[PDB]
């Protein structure tokens, strides 16, 4: 369908951990990024790679793992240790297979949330539940970068959201078949699940250190669009002649908030305002099936107009409960951005303004 899993939602279920042996040289670099970046051997190892055909990656899961592998290597290659010594040309023997794979998966050739969070995890024990204690990431960048904590907590938020996402068909089927009680129950269930997702979001503090996120991890998630360090973009050697710009926005490419904006008829992509165009651009960095899901929801009849047309206080309160849970998520997200980016930075205003307008637009959708 739309590659939305009942249990893990937008996340990739049971991600592949190992590539075929043909790709051992890629996997070795990706698995040893902390040591290779620290010593300074990372870039030489990449420049020494043979060109490996992507022909031995034949299913979605091995393609997604290879994208995660190549994406981590690319971020490490471009940024190095993170102190201004950058590389402006990605060597052909990585760029060509990376771009070909990205074309097949319909994603930009840069590390994205769908790689480093949605595909970057495993269960320690397959017979135990999806808890931090029973999970790990597949790749990290530097020792002490809190990639395990940041990636896995984001993933646990996605998983919590899966419980609301799976109710969405019930919502549209109830509006269709005129089942008022069913719609009301479904909206309450969504609000309840979104409230639980907010509680899971609190775990960012349990597992992510602000200094480590801002000064280490954020470097490798950063991109080359409007970046003075790579003002023209990156040269994907042997694929495109001229450099191309792509955003590094892993920490804000989730489909979850936009999913419920569209569900609830909140028009965040409306107009030429900068917030709309930024949220529209983020979609290009989501998996195509998830972009298609978001567009399908926009094309369905409006949940908001349905609730507004019925003179039904119970329905309006269920709907408002959903909007308020989304407002609560975005408000806590603002707090997080303050603790993990702005405070460490000052020891910017466009970022917080963008986030506040998006929350404000959400808050304006309340009926009461
Ligand atoms: C340490 C934790 C986090 C930090 C520092 C952070 C940072 C940011 C930043 C800087 C942006 C602006 C766009 C960008 O620069 O990429 C953003 C937006 C966004 N973030 Fe995060 N983020 C964090 C955790 C999360 C989590 C766990 C989620 C959801 C699972 C999330 C979902 C979003 C979304 C959906 C947006 C788009 C704006 C919106 O729709 O309200 N973030 N975040």
Curated annotation (Swiss-Prot):
The EC number(s) this enzyme carries: 1.13.11.52
Inhibition and activation profile: Activity is inhibited by and MTH-trp (methylthiohydantoin-DL-tryptophan), modestly inhibited by L-1MT (1-methyl-L-tryptophan) but not D-1MT (1-methyl-D-tryptophan).
Subunit structure comment from the entry: Monomer.
Lineage: Eukaryota, Metazoa, Chordata, Craniata, Vertebrata
Comment field (misc): IDO1 is the target for therapy in a range of clinical settings, including cancer, chronic infections, autoimmune and allergic syndromes, and transplantation.
Main location: cytoplasm
Name recorded for this polypeptide: Indoleamine 2,3-dioxygenase 1
Top-level EC class as recorded in UniProt: oxidoreductase
Residue positions binding heme b: 333
Record's note on what induces expression: By IFNG/IFN-gamma in most cells. Exogenous inflammatory stimuli induce the expression of IDO1 in antigen-presenting cells such as dendritic cells, macrophages and B-cells.
Catalytic activity: D-tryptophan + O2 = N-formyl-D-kynurenine; L-tryptophan + O2 = N-formyl-L-kynurenine
Molecular function terms from GO: electron transfer activity; heme binding; indoleamine 2,3-dioxygenase activity; metal ion binding; tryptophan 2,3-dioxygenase activity
Cofactor note: Binds 1 heme group per subunit. In the active form, the heme iron is in its ferrous state Fe(+2). The catalytic cycle does not alter the oxidation state of the heme, but IDO1 is prone to autoxidation.
PROSITE patterns referenced in this protein's UniProt entry, alphabetically: IDO_1, IDO_2
Keywords (A to Z) from UniProt: Cytoplasm, Dioxygenase, Heme, Immunity, Iron, Metal-binding, Oxidoreductase, Tryptophan catabolism
GO biological process, one term: swimming behavior
Tissues showing expression: Expressed in mature dendritic cells located in lymphoid organs (including lymph nodes, spleen, tonsils, Peyers's patches, the gut lamina propria, and the thymic medulla), in some epithelial cells of the female genital tract, as well as in endothelial cells of term placenta and in lung parenchyma. Weakly or not expressed in most normal tissues, but mostly inducible in most tissues. Expressed in more than 50% of tumors, either by tumoral, stromal, or endothelial cells (expression in tumor is associated with a worse clinical outcome). Not overexpressed in tumor-draining lymph nodes.
A family per Pfam: IDO
């Amino acid at each position: 369908a739309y590659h939305i899993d009942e249990e893990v939602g937008f996340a990739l279920p049971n991600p592949q951990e190992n590539l075929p042996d043909f790709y051992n040289d890629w996997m070795f670099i990706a698995k040893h990024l902390p040591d290779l970046i620290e010593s300074g051997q990372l870039r030489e190892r990449v420049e020494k790679l043979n060109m490996l055909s992507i022909d031995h990656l034949t299913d979605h899961k091995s393609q997604r793992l290879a994208r995660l592998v190549l994406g981590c290597i690319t971020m490490a290659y471009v940024w190095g240790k993170g102190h201004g010594d950058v590389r402006k040309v990605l060597p052909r023997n990585i760029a060509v297979p990376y771009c070909q794979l990205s074309a097949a998966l319909e994603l930009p050739p840069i590390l994205v949330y769908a790689d480093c969070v949605l595909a970057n995890w495993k269960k320690k024990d397959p017979n135990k539940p999806l808890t931090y204690e029973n999970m790990d990431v597949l790749f990290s960048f530097r020792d002490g970068d809190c990639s395990k904590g940041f990636f896995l907590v984001s993933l646990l938020v996605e998983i919590a959201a899966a419980s609301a996402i799976k109710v969405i068909p019930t919502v549209f089927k109830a509006m269709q078949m005129q089942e008022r009680d069913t719609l009301l129950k479904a909206l309450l269930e969504i609000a309840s699940c979104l409230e639980k997702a907010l509680q899971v979001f609190h775990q960012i503090h349990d597992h992510v250190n602000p200094k480590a996120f801002f000064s280490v991890l954020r470097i490798y998630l950063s991109g080359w669009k409007g970046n003075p360090q790579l003002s023209d973009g990156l040269v994907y050697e042997g694929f495109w002649e001229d450099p191309k710009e792509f955003a590094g926005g892993s920490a804000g490419q989730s489909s979850v908030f936009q999913c419920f904006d569209v569900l609830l008829g909140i028009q965040q992509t409306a107009g030429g305002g900068h917030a709309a165009q930024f949220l529209q651009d983020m979609r290009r960095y989501m998996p195509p099936a998830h972009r298609n899901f978001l567009c399908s929801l926009e094309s369905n009849p409006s949940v908001r107009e349905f609730v507004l047309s019925k003179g039904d206080a119970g329905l309006r309160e269920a709907y408002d409960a959903c909007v308020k849970a989304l407002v609560s998520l975005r408000s806590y997200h603002l707090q997080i951005v303050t603790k993990y980016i702005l405070i460490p930075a000052s020891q910017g205003t466009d970022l917080m303004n963008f986030l506040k307008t998006v929350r404000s637009t959400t808050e304006k959708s309340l009926l009461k």
